[PDB]
Amino acid sequence: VVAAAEKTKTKEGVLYVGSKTKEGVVHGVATVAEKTKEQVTNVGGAVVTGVTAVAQKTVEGAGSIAAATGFVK
Amino acid sequence: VVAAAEKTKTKEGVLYVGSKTKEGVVHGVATVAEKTKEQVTNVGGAVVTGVTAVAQKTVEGAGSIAAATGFVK
Amino acid sequence: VVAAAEKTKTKEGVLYVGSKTKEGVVHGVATVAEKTKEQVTNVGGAVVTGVTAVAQKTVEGAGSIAAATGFVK
Amino acid sequence: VVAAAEKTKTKEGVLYVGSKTKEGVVHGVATVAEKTKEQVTNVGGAVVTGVTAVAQKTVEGAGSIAAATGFVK
Amino acid sequence: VVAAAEKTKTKEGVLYVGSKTKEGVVHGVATVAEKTKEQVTNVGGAVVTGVTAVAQKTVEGAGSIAAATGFVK
């Protein structure tokens, strides 16, 4: 499991957000197990969670994610 | 499982968002197991979750995701 | 499972969003198992989930996703 | 499990956010186990969770995440 | 499990946030186990959790996260 990233090197990249929420419940990244034997989970990269969510320009530079997720029996 | 990313190198990339929500529930990335034996899960890359979700220009630079997900018995 | 991405190098890329929702429930990426033996899942790339969802210019740069998902018995 | 990142080297990168929420519950990254035997979880990269969440320009420089998640029996 | 990061080398990178919340509960990163045998968890990288969360320019320099998470029996 190898990840390699290389980077070699007027409004730009500007965000305005206004949010109004009377009630918010946000769970993000969740793993829940109840009465479970084996649970293998991988979350990688960018997760944005919101009642309002904005992602801008998330990976302008090279980004690499490598995941091996699992079990051997 | 190998990921490689390489990058070699007027309004641009501008977002305006206004959101109003009286109630919001957002779950993002969730794995739930109830009475489960084996559960293998991989989430990779960018997940944006919102009552309002905006993704702009997510990977201008080279992005790589590699996933191997599973079990061997 | 190999992914390689290479990048070599007036309004442009501008988004305006207004959203009003009295109630929102959003689930994003979810895996649920109930009374399940084996569940192998992979989510890759960009997922945008919203009561309002906008994706703009998601991968201007080269993007690669490679997935192997499964089991060997 | 190896990750390598290399970086070699008018409003730019500016965000305005206004948020008003009467009530907020946010869970971030959560792993919950109840009556569970084995639970292996990995969260990698950037997670932004909010009643309002903004991510801007998250990885301008090269970013690498490598994960191996799992069990061998 | 090896991570290597190398870096070699008008408003820029400016954020304004105003937030008003009458009530906030935020959980950040949480692992909870109740009546559980084995629970292995890894959280890596940047997690921002908020009733309002903003992440700007999180990794301009090269960032690497490597995780091996799991058990061998």
From Swiss-Prot, chains A, B, C, D, E:
Residues the record lists as Phosphoserine modifications: 64
Effect on the protein upon substituting residue 12 to K: No effect on oligomerization
Sequence ranges of the Sequence repeats: 10-18, 19-33, 34-44
Residue positions binding Cu cation: 27
Subcellular location per the Swiss-Prot or TrEMBL entry: Cytoplasm; Membrane; Nucleus; Synapse
Post-translational modification: Phosphorylated, predominantly on serine residues. Phosphorylation by CK1 appears to occur on residues distinct from the residue phosphorylated by other kinases.
GO molecular function: actin binding; alpha-tubulin binding; beta-tubulin binding; calcium ion binding; copper ion binding; cuprous ion binding; cysteine-type endopeptidase inhibitor activity; dynein complex binding
Gene Ontology annotations for the cellular component aspect, listed alphabetically: actin cytoskeleton; axon; axon terminus; cell cortex; cytoplasm; cytosol; extracellular region; extracellular space
Protein keywords: Acetylation, Alzheimer disease, Amyloid, Cell projection, Copper, Cytoplasm, Disease variant, Membrane, Metal-binding, Neurodegeneration, Nucleus, Parkinson disease, Parkinsonism, Phosphoprotein, Repeat, Secreted, Synapse, Ubl conjugation
Keyword Transmembrane among UniProt keywords: no
Membrane-crossing residue ranges in chain numbering: none
A biological process from GO: positive regulation of protein localization to cell periphery
Region described as 4 X 11 AA tandem repeats of [EGS]-K-T-K-[EQ]-[GQ]-V-X(4): 6-44
Expression sites by tissue: Highly expressed in presynaptic terminals in the central nervous system. Expressed principally in brain.
Consequence when changing residue 27 to A: Impairs copper-binding
Disease cited in the entry: Genetic alterations of SNCA resulting in aberrant polymerization into fibrils, are associated with several neurodegenerative diseases (synucleinopathies). SNCA fibrillar aggregates represent the major non A-beta component of Alzheimer disease amyloid plaque, and a major component of Lewy body inclusions. They are also found within Lewy body (LB)-like intraneuronal inclusions, glial inclusions and axonal spheroids in neurodegeneration with brain iron accumulation type 1.
UniProt remark on domains: The 'non A-beta component of Alzheimer disease amyloid plaque' domain (NAC domain) is involved in fibrils formation. The middle hydrophobic region forms the core of the filaments. The C-terminus may regulate aggregation and determine the diameter of the filaments.
Quaternary structure (record): Soluble monomer. Homotetramer. A dynamic intracellular population of tetramers and monomers coexists normally and the tetramer plays an essential role in maintaining homeostasis. Interacts with UCHL1. Interacts with phospholipase D and histones. Interacts (via N-terminus) with synphilin-1/SNCAIP; this interaction promotes formation of SNCA inclusions in the cytoplasm. Interacts with CALM1. Interacts with STXBP1; this interaction controls SNCA self-replicating aggregation. Interacts with SNARE components VAMP2 and SNAP25; these interactions allows SNARE complex assembly and integrity.
Family the UniProt entry places it in: Belongs to the synuclein family.
Name of this chain's protein: Alpha-synuclein
Taxonomic classification: Eukaryota, Metazoa, Chordata, Craniata, Vertebrata
